[PDB]
Amino acid sequence: FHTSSFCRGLFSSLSTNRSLTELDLSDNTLGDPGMRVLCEALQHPGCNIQRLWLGRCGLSHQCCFDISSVLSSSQKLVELDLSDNALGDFGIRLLCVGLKHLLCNLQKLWLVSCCLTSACCQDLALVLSSNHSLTRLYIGENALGDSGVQVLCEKMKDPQCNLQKLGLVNSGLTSICCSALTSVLKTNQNFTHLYLRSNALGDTGLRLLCEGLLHPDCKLQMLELDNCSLTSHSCWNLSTILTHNHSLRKLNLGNNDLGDLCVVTLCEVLKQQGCLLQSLQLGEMYLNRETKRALEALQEEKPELTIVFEI
Amino acid sequence: DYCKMYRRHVRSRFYSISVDLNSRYTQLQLVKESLKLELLFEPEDGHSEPVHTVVFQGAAGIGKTILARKIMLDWALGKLFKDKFDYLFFIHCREVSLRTPRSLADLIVSCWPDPNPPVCKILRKPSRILFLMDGFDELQGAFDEHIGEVCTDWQKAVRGDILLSSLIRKKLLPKASLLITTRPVALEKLQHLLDHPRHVEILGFSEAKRKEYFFKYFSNELQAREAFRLIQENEVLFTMCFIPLVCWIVCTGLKQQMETGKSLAQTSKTTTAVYVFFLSSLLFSDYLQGLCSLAADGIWNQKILFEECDLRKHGLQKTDVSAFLRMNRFYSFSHMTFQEFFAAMYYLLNRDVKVLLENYGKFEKGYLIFVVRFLFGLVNQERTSYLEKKLSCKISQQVRLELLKWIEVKAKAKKLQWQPSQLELFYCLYEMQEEDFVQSAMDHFPKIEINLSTRMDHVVSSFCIKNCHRVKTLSLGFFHTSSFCRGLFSSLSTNRSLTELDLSDNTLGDPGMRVLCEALQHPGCNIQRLWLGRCGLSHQCCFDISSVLSSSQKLVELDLSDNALGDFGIRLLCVGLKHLLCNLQKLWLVSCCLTSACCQDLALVLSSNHSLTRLYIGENALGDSGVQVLCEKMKDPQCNLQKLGLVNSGLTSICCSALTSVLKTNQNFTHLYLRSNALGDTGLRLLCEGLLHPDCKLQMLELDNCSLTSHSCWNLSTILTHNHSLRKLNLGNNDLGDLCVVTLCEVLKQQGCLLQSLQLGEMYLNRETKRALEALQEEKPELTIVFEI
Ligand SMILES: CC(C)(O)c1coc(S(=O)(=O)NC(=O)Nc2c3c(cc4c2CCC4)C=CC3)c1
Ligand SMILES: Nc1ncnc2c1ncn2[C@@H]1O[C@H](COP(=O)(O)OP(=O)(O)O)[C@@H](O)[C@H]1O
Prior knowledge:
Number of strands of chain A: 7
Largest sheet of chain A: 5 strands, parallel
Entry title: Cryo-EM structure of mouse NLRP3 (full-length) dodecamer
Keywords: NOD-like receptor, nlrp3, Inflammasome, immune system
Organism of A, B: Mus musculus
Shape of chain A: elongated
Bound molecules: ligand 7YN, adenosine-5'-diphosphate
Largest interface: A-B, 6 and 6 residues
Helix content of chain A: 40-55%
Strand content of chain A: 5-15%
Number of helices of chain A: 11
Chains A, B: NACHT, LRR and PYD domains-containing protein 3
Distance between the termini of chain A: 39 Å
PDB class: immune system
Order of helices and strands of chain A: HEHEHEHEHEHHHHHEHE
Strand order of the largest sheet of chain A: 1-2-3-4-5
Oligomer: part of a larger assembly
């Protein structure tokens, strides 16, 4: 709170510390040379850090070279955060060299709001077939777009891909990439969670998602759709998804004008014992009194199916 | 009102080009050397010299005539030049014969519908009057001798060329407006006659504009869509369709094909021979000979408005008028390119081909090359056979050998200014499409320089370079490119002869540089030299270049001057440089926006790479810290660096001790540059400290503009008296004083000094100083001096 000399003097001892496991440095404007000095500190064999969060650190593409060296040299790191640093597509291109290294043990990788574009996506694709320890990815709040999402997914469809909890919050997508996502759901057997909020998917996009959701080989255990700007036309598709998907166990429909008929049809679909859904949200809309009675009833006979219908 | 009826008359004249103009019209792309058509005459800057001088350039069939007629019709329809101008006039070179002297009154009367215009009323406000000169390629027939003939009377009857030349320089109606449309070939002299013009080039259709044109041509939407699809079936034809004339020809050909039942894919399959295939699909030897001779005599005589006498001479009769020709009696070709095509076809059915070879240049902007282009089109063995078997005629074959000899004449000549550009030669060699003779007549280009500005340029360059097999030096110009770079540089990796590749000043960008990097690292390429000055690169390209260096062992030198690589970019490069397989020898890094921080990394290179001989890191904010860091690690005698340079590095005497250590230790550090550094006399003394060392090897020491003085002057004397190895020097912009110069003289007098050059440029010495310098030059002539300012 106001540092190359500062960073050296502090982090020299941290490499010799054999007990440290988590290192938080969020919101510190330690700058890029400080991040470099931290990188020379970490890659010492003594340090036992398994966790490094660097949100809003003010880094840039320059630190990515050093971080790639750290990843290629250190086998104890588990997750890593880089949210809200202007890494850019070049920064991602630099990171992927370290990520693709056979000794990279990364599992959780945040890249939220890293000022990326679709161009970096191709490189990221290679990671999924070079690194198998990468379980969950978070590349939301970037101008990826349909081209980038398609590039990532087309290479992601391999069942050997180990990715689980991808997220594309506020990626500016539409229904075009939904076919690729459908292919991913049809093929992958480990892609459990998936986020899509603030994307203009539309009812056509939801139908395209349903195309792969109904697949008997599906494994999706959640599908966020908040603020997707949906409508009541693909509502039969929602009914079909609930009636046939025995694996999906959560959902989100916030800021989606579905209409009273849709809510009551959701209710009557949920009534039967053939649905294993265990959570659902309808936050922030204006429903009807009959709708409220139906929701209260369904909560009454089955208490497991939690709803956040109240705004 | 007079303007209203005049506008109605010119609307009636320019309604059609027959076929309606506006309905078939499609927008074009133009850029000032995009500039909107409504934004022509207002000055972008408030201090523009008279805006009335704008010149237009474009290819054959680009639409200069169509643009002129479209702007005239807009002025006739109430669209443009209503609140700005009031009168627009049309003048044509073909109609205005140069042999008959005329006046502006004649042109106005011809343009006015009424043969009795109010000449007194319409010659008072030239600001609202714009004169259009289209097809300027028929005016400079005597400008090379009529430079000093000037006419300023609007009613005076003087030769058309002289009067128009008077109009151009803004002296006859100087405040009136002018709009000239020209071929870009021969503007070199015309710019002398121009008083602050604006040169605007016309580029033609884009993809959407092409689709719009096919929609506006065919009356059937489905047929237009099928034509569009088959155009995209052939990439070459789709690229060629950026010229509206080619679009018109292909649309007419497709119409003829589908009306007669012929398939449309055959047109797409036909490449580079649109005119010949179109003529064959449209359709006798006497007719062909007569039309060809008419075109040839029009070529010689610069005549387009043929009369009956020409047809009588050529044997052409009244029943010999076809679609290509036009009756108005007046005979005129519909479009000139057809006339040059017929003239080219003439010489294969004066018949001496040498007139095309040597009499080029007698006509401005060179109609002949275009002619000769179709010649390379027709002499193609398959195309020659097709012509013979489709017209039952015979084609001469010695013409091909004569064209070969002309190719070597063009390639090996000295006075290359008058000849057209080499890109025209590449257009010809792509037009012909005969592999073996392309290779044979193309092995005569060891060095290739081309400037590319369109898809046609890229395609012909790719084909030509792929055909090349013995080229050493190659340069490129991207004068306005990831797809462009891929299409070109894919072949360069397969080229086993290239050794030098110049790309300076091209704004190829960073992704283009990346694509170039994937092109180079292929094992096939034999490039030993890559210059990239002012390429506009950045730190991103450094990763790719480092990969290239670590993967390629044929590269020798490399230039990166004036790119904002930065210290991070240097950090990225050093990884490739430190690689054991890097064979770099010469590395320029001038003005790379570096700082001292990168210097440390550079130091490692000198002890990781031993092939790096000479370095040039001048014009950077390195400073004393960076220079000391570099030198302290450079002092090892095993370091192989020779010709380091630190021009304008902002140094002072602090780093001079480190430089002294380098000179004392290193045995290969021959040259060294220090200009524009505030070293001072203390710095020069510190340099002398190591200069006097018996182990020194410094063979030059530049000191220009170092801001020296006369206090360390004894040190200069000592350096000359003791250094037996130093053989050059520079002291420009250094106030040393007369005593210093004369002491330098007397020191140099003795035979113990082996200095072989010295400079004292740009100072104010004495008469005695000049006599001493002249004397020392007299007794020993080897010691050259540039003392004279
Ligand atoms: C060097 C430079 C800039 O390309 C140039 C210099 O001079 C000229 S031009 O004025 O001769 N115009 C043309 O050749 N147009 C033209 C072209 C193609 C095909 C045709 C034509 C005319 C009919 C068929 C293909 C590319 C250009 C152009
Ligand atoms: N703006 C345009 N819209 C539609 N067609 C055009 C346009 N410009 C040129 N053309 C085509 O080009 C032909 C005329 O070319 P022209 O303007 O005489 O070339 P240049 O101006 O180089 O002499 C016509 O047949 C027409 O089909």
